[PDB]
């Protein structure tokens, strides 16, 4: 419902679909906008997902809501079980995706990381934190987890990096864009909005751009290990990267089916290296 | 009504119209397209809206639908008022805005589906093609398309107020304005397929062009600036190289059509005459 969908679903068709997330991108510009963390028009609260055992000091997980137009609060549902009686899981939504007319997109991504990095010191109190993301919501992690050390004081204990494709490593991206375009159309549970698909098309630009920090925080690298397409050999490597990750992870399924239908392998690779990195 | 048109306002608002207007053509890539003049989507038979005496091979005008997104049907009303009793006036539609129209893959294909329907409504009359603003610059598109393609070139052509790349300072120091107009001149919501044809159409007429039609061309300039003009900056008004007759209306780029369309028709008539 809208031109915007009806154009994506186009691109896609056409195979354009690195071409109209520019488009996205540049038309985002255009709506209203929040220019600092308190002017956020929506509440950021984290949702409790998970519950750890009752049995302080322990980390807590915190998923960080990735980028894709067809997502929201059902995003880490799958992950989260397996989390119960283990860590206590907390997620975090993505400014500019609300509704309440529709939400306003940050001006700059340091915008959305503040008002982020505020309603979870919040919620967290003096628990140790891990940030955890999946493609889109992988890079917004990391970028979180800097923003947490150099403006909050408060650098993660971590950070869960599942299948981060980082500007470097962007071949498997452009090979794969009409699979990736696909993917968000099968993932739909609801037709994808106008207003959150110009939110995607703005953190992908966000994205894109310089972003010179990187966090002291050490680095879960989890990577599927079926190609989302085909890729021919003499490219290099399809798989996910990350420079310098503290320990690699890989997992049943691709891109999507990784979280999809292999979501217990992800949750198992990452309650393992919590326990190596807290004793 | 549709996300485009709320992002558009904001544009004019924060004065970013050109910067819009580029996001639209850009957009306007993935909409379905015509790639030859046969596949047009819409029936562009032209609509009469004044008639001549009867009485000839006298010229009738056809007036040359601009890209306007809040444009269409009306444009020409005013205007063809003052024609009634002088001249037959056809009004041909643009294609593109008429399930919603196919979008042109390039100019050349809309100015062959209209150089068609034109050619059939016409008969055996000659024809003076008339557009004002961007269909000023389309009139004279056609104009070349029909003497190149279709071995017909047109007896006249009409500029109102033309702004041709390479004397297009004016009116993009106005855009705010044109922005403005647009929704100021609007009976109905802007509708997302229209706003993405006027993108396309614009960026069309900025694109480089294969030459210049031989047909006479009357130039009418309006009188009053539409905004702000430092008189160092040069002549703010419309252009077009050595027209055949130039004439000077009262109004502004809007107004000369808005409550000045007699005057024009005036000027119209008397050259009619003189180029015949
Ligand atoms: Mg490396």
Same mark, same amino acid.
Request: hydrophobic share 45%.
């Given at each position: 419902?809208?031109?915007?969908?009806?154009?994506?679903?186009?691109? @896609? +068709? /056409?195979?354009?679909? !690195? +071409?109209?997330?520019?488009?996205?991108?540049?038309? $985002?510009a255009f709506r209203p906008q929040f220019a600092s963390?308190?002017?956020?028009?929506?509440?950021?609260?984290?949702?409790?997902?998970?519950? =750890?055992?009752?049995?302080?000091?322990?980390?807590?997980?915190?998923?960080?809501? !990735?980028?894709?137009?067809?997502?929201?609060?059902? +995003?880490?549902?799958?992950?989260?079980? $397996?989390?119960?009686?283990?860590?206590?899981?907390?997620? *975090?939504?993505?400014?500019?995706?609300?509704? =309440?007319?529709?939400?306003?997109?940050?001006?700059?991504?340091?915008?959305?990381?503040?008002?982020?990095?505020?309603?979870?010191?919040?919620?967290? !109190?003096?628990?140790?934190? @891990?940030?955890?993301?999946?493609?889109?919501?992988?890079?917004?992690?990391? +970028?979180?987890?800097?923003?947490?050390?150099?403006?909050?004081?408060?650098?993660?204990?971590?950070? *869960?990096? @599942?299948?981060?494709?980082?500007?470097?490593?962007?071949?498997?991206?452009?090979?794969?864009?009409?699979?990736?375009?696909?993917?968000?159309?099968?993932?739909? &549970?609801?037709?994808?909005? /106008?207003?959150?698909?110009?939110?995607?098309?703005?953190?992908?630009?966000?994205?894109? !751009?310089?972003?010179?920090?990187? $966090?002291?925080?050490?680095?879960?690298? @989890?990577?599927?290990?079926?190609? &989302?397409?085909?890729?021919?050999?003499?490219?290099?490597?399809?798989?996910?990267?990350?420079?310098?990750?503290?320990?690699?992870?890989?997992?049943?399924?691709?891109?999507?089916?990784?979280?999809? /239908?292999?979501?217990?392998?992800?949750?198992?690779?990452?309650?393992?290296?919590?326990d190596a990195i807290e004793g």
């Amino acid at each position: 419902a809208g031109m915007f969908r009806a154009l994506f679903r186009q691109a @896609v +068709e /056409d195979d354009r679909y !690195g +071409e109209f997330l520019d488009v996205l991108a540049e038309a $985002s510009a255009f709506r209203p906008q929040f220019a600092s963390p308190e002017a956020c028009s929506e509440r950021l609260d984290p949702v409790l997902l998970a519950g =750890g055992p009752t049995d302080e000091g322990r980390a807590v997980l915190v998923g960080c809501t !990735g980028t894709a137009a067809n997502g929201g609060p059902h +995003e880490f549902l799958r992950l989260s079980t $397996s989390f119960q009686e283990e860590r206590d899981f907390l997620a *975090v939504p993505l400014p500019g995706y609300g509704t =309440g007319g529709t939400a306003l997109l940050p001006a700059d991504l340091d915008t959305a990381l503040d008002a982020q990095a505020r309603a979870i010191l919040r919620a967290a !109190g003096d628990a140790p934190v @891990v940030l955890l993301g999946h493609s889109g919501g992988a890079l917004l992690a990391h +970028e979180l987890a800097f923003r947490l050390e150099r403006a909050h004081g408060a650098p993660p204990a971590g950070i *869960v990096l @599942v299948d981060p494709y980082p500007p470097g490593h962007q071949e498997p991206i452009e090979v794969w864009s009409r699979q990736l375009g696909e993917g968000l159309f099968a993932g739909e &549970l609801e037709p994808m909005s /106008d207003a959150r698909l110009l939110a995607m098309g703005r953190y992908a630009r966000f994205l894109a !751009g310089p972003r010179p920090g990187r $966090s002291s925080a050490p680095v879960l690298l @989890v990577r599927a290990s079926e190609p &989302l397409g085909d890729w021919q050999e003499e490219r290099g490597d399809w798989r996910a990267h990350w420079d310098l990750p503290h320990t690699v992870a890989d997992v049943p399924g691709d891109h999507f089916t990784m979280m999809r /239908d292999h979501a217990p392998a992800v949750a198992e690779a990452v309650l393992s290296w919590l326990d190596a990195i807290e004793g």
